[PDB]
Amino acid sequence: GSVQIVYKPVDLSKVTSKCGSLGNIHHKPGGGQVEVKSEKLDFKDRVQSKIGSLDNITHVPGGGNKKIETHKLTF
Amino acid sequence: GSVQIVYKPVDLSKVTSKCGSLGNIHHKPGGGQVEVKSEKLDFKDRVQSKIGSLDNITHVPGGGNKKIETHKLTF
Amino acid sequence: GSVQIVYKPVDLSKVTSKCGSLGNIHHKPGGGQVEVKSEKLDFKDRVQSKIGSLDNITHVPGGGNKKIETHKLTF
Amino acid sequence: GSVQIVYKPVDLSKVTSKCGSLGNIHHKPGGGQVEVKSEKLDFKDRVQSKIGSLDNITHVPGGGNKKIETHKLTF
Amino acid sequence: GSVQIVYKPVDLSKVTSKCGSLGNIHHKPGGGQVEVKSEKLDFKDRVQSKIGSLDNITHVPGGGNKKIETHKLTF
Amino acid sequence: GSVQIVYKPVDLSKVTSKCGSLGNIHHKPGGGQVEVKSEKLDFKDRVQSKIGSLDNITHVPGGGNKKIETHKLTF
Numbered sequence: 001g002s003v004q005i006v007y008k009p010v011d012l013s014k015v016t017s018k019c020g021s022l023g024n025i026h027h028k029p030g031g032g033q034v035e036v037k038s039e040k041l042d043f044k045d046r047v048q049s050k051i052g053s054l055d056n057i058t059h060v061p062g063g064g065n066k067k068i069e070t071h072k073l074t075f
Numbered sequence: 076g077s078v079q080i081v082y083k084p085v086d087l088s089k090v091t092s093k094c095g096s097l098g099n100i101h102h103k104p105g106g107g108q109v110e111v112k113s114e115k116l117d118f119k120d121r122v123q124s125k126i127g128s129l130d131n132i133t134h135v136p137g138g139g140n141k142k143i144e145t146h147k148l149t150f
Numbered sequence: 151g152s153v154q155i156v157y158k159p160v161d162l163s164k165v166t167s168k169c170g171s172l173g174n175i176h177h178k179p180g181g182g183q184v185e186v187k188s189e190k191l192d193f194k195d196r197v198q199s200k201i202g203s204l205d206n207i208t209h210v211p212g213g214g215n216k217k218i219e220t221h222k223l224t225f
Numbered sequence: 226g227s228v229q230i231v232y233k234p235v236d237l238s239k240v241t242s243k244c245g246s247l248g249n250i251h252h253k254p255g256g257g258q259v260e261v262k263s264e265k266l267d268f269k270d271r272v273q274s275k276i277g278s279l280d281n282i283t284h285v286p287g288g289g290n291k292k293i294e295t296h297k298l299t300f
Numbered sequence: 301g302s303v304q305i306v307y308k309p310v311d312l313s314k315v316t317s318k319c320g321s322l323g324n325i326h327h328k329p330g331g332g333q334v335e336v337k338s339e340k341l342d343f344k345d346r347v348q349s350k351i352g353s354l355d356n357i358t359h360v361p362g363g364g365n366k367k368i369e370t371h372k373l374t375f
Numbered sequence: 376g377s378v379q380i381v382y383k384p385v386d387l388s389k390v391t392s393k394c395g396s397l398g399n400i401h402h403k404p405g406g407g408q409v410e411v412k413s414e415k416l417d418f419k420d421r422v423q424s425k426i427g428s429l430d431n432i433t434h435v436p437g438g439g440n441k442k443i444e445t446h447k448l449t450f
Contacts, residue, residue, distance in 0.1 A: 001077040002152045008081075009146050011163040013088040019138040019169045020208065021131070024099045026175065031182030032106025034127030040190045042117045044443060047195070052109075052184030053128040053203045056171070058095065060135045061211045063169040067142045068218045068344055068419060071159050074149045075225045086163070106182055119368060119443055127184070135169075139212075143269055143344060146159070218419055227301040231308075236388070238313040244363065249324045256332025256407055259352075263336075268343045277334030277409075278353040281321070285360045285394075285437075288319040292367045296309050296384070299374045302377045311388040319394045320433065326400065331407030334427075342417045352409030353428040356396070361436045363394040371384050373448045 094138030169213030244288030319363030
């Protein structure tokens with residue numbers, strides 16, 4: 001007689017990452033008065049300083065997608 | 076006789092990551108007054124300093140997706 | 151006799167990354183008054199200073215997409 | 226009258242860390258026979274593998290020293 | 301009359317770190333026969349492999365020394 | 376009257392780091408026979424591989440020294 005094989009796998013899937021700041025509404029963001037007075041100060045090592053900022057920061061080392069498939073037909 | 080194999084797996088899946096700040100409403104965010112007076116301070120060491128900031132921060136080392144499939148037909 | 155093999159795998163899948171700041175609304179962002187007075191200060195190591203900023207920042211070392219497929223037929 | 230202050234603190238201290246592998250004797254370390262046969266293994270995930278090694282490993286995130294002194298004479 | 305001050309503090313101290321592999325003796329380190337037969341194996345993620353090594357490894361993120369002093373005379 | 380101040384602080388201290396591989400003896404290090412037979416292997420991501428090594432390795436992100444002093448005489 002005979003052998004018939006019909007290998008028709010289908011992928012319609014979605015793999016999605018949405019990482020960070022998305023679709024947010026910032027409406028009339030204002031600010032208070034900020035005042036800094038400094039004297040005789042001394043520093044021996046690294047300084048980071050942030051004064052009176054209005055900001056939005058987003059950092060994304062992640063959010064990566066990996067997709068693997070194998071399709072083997074062996075007679 | 077005969078052999079007939081029909082092989083039709085269908086993938087309709089969604090794999091989704093939504094990581095960070097999504098769809099928030101920030102309405103009229105303001106600030107009260109911030110005042111800082113400093114003298115004779117001495118620092119022997121690292122300094123990070125934040126004064127009177129209004130901010131949003133999002134950090135995402137995660138939120139990754141991994142999808143794996145195998146489709147083996149051996150006769 | 152006979153053998154008939156039909157091999158017709160279909161991939162219509164989507165692999166997508168959306169990393170950073172997307173589709174946000176910033177409406178009438180303002181600022182309060184910021185004033186900084188400094189004297190007799192001293193430097194022994196790196197200083198980063200940020201004063202009175204209005205900004206958005208996005209940094210994305212991630213968000214990469216990797217897709218692998220194998221399609222083996224062996225009689 | 227008169228005031229005489231003599232201020233002579235003497236520090237002879239030792240602060241010592243000895244961290245890891247120190248002063249060991251390894252004499253004629255050999256090995257028995259190691260043989261590994263593998264087939265059809267499949268890995269979906271990270272692999273670390275170690276076969277038939279003879280080794281010494283030392284890892285030291287610690288072993289640090291901190292010494293602080295203050296010598297105040299206020300009249 | 302008079303005031304006499306003689307501020308003569310002395311530091312002869314030792315602050316020492318000895319981190320890692322120190323003063324060890326390895327005498328005639330040999331090895332056994334190592335044999336690896338691998339076939340049809342498959343890997344989908346990062347692989348680290350070490351076969352038949354004779355080695356000594358030392359890793360030291362630590363072993364640091366920090367020394368601080370202050371010497372204040374105030375009349 | 377009179378005031379006499381003598382201010383003669385002495386530091387002869389030692390701050391020392393000895394980090395890594397120091398003063399070890401390796402006498403007649405040899406090796407056994409190492410044999411690897413590999414066939415039909417498949418890898419989809421980064422591979423680090425070390426086979427049959429005789430070596431010594433040292434890595435030192437640490438071992439730093441930090442020394443601070445302050446010497447204040449205020450009348």
